[PDB]
Amino acid sequence: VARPPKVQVYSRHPAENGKPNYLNCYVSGFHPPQIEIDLLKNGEKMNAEQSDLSFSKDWSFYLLVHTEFTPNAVDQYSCRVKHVTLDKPKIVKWDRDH
Amino acid sequence: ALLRTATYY
Amino acid sequence: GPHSLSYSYTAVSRPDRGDSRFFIVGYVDDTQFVRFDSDAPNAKMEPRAQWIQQEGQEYWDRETQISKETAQNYRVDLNTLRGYYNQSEAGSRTIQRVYGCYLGPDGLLLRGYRQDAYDGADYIALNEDLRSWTAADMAAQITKRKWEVVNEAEGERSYLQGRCVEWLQKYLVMGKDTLQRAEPPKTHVTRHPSSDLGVTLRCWALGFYPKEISLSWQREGQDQSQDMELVETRPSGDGTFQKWAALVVPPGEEQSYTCHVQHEGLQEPLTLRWD
């Protein structure tokens, strides 16, 4: 039983250029628990922390991977996820409106 | 607080 | 709703190295408060919420001891289920376990539970009566009979009806101002143009706790849940949650659509509209 990760990329508070915030990559609904998550600023890995591995009622796993950041009209952010269920890595760009 | 059992499968 | 203390175990074998990895996360309702990782340097049970930090070393030594005893058992348990299913010794496999207690209005056990899964599939479960087990297949029946032979259920039951609900009460006190008060969502609406005949309105609900909310779009009192884009509730990163609901309306009809937010932090349900 293998399940692919669902990815959601967002900020903790409404993105407002110049004001310090939190870039979140919420990965969930996946199985087995071995997973690889990198946060990207213009295509480059940063330095990030994650919440502890947890699971839902349906036994699928979920963790939040996040870092502190300051948004602007210039910088592009995204989340890169790798998992046994994926052909290649799944990159999901950050869209402040969704 | 955790449950203290160590019963094998 | 009624409060709950829960623990999640995850045991993953690593036939590669000769070992396995073991995770515990503790929850009161939807708030994580403790964690354990066998792969952590000199691994112990750790606080994961500001309100549990006030516990003495006597508390942490006990939970740490229990974590490692359990982690050691699961090292063998993985091998056992592998043998139960006549599986090769090459692949990484997983056992998961959830158990906990719900608090009743009288301060006694409302309901207690335990359920286990192997490789993502339901394996064994403790029955509501807390004196019997239900097995999903043959392998689990071997396991079921072992636990009957040593009366595992009675240890579980004495825990659930006693220690579990007692500590739950304490945790609810320790963290009463985050656990026990509802946090209302910070709500606003945004407008996003598409094409000539498409404008997207997005109703936001941010920083709310608990996780349960209702978001609906109505058109002049008429439900639009059919063509409404609604996202999975997501963590804010601070123990609160986010959600949004959107739908595409015509560029003229912004005022004809209203977003309705219902959350227990709210005094009266909200009707929002784009400005």
Numbering used by the authors:
A (entry chain B): 1 to 98
B (entry chain C): 1 to 9
C (entry chain A): 1 to 275
What did the study's authors say about this model?
The two peptides Hu64 and As64 are derived from residues 64–72 of the immunodominant antigen VP1 protein of the FMDV O and Asia 1 serotypes, respectively. The overall structure of SLA-2*HB01 retains the characteristics of MHC I molecules common in other mammals. Among these, the α1 and α2 domains form a typical peptide-binding groove, which contains two α-helices and eight β-sheets, and the Hu64 and As64 peptides are embedded in the groove.
The crystal was estimated to contain two SLA-2*HB01–Hu64–sβ2m molecules in the asymmetric unit. Interestingly, it was found that Hu64 displayed two different electron density states, indicating that there might be two conformations in the refolding of Hu64-binding SLA-2*HB01 molecules. The first conformation (CM1) of Hu64 is tighter than that of the second conformation of Hu64 (CM2) in terms of electron density. Further analysis showed that conformations 1 (CM1) and 2 (CM2) of the SLA-2*HB01–Hu64–sβ2m crystals exist in different folding states, mainly related to P5 residues (Thr), i.e., the P5 (Thr) in CM1, but not CM2, serves as an anchor amino acid.
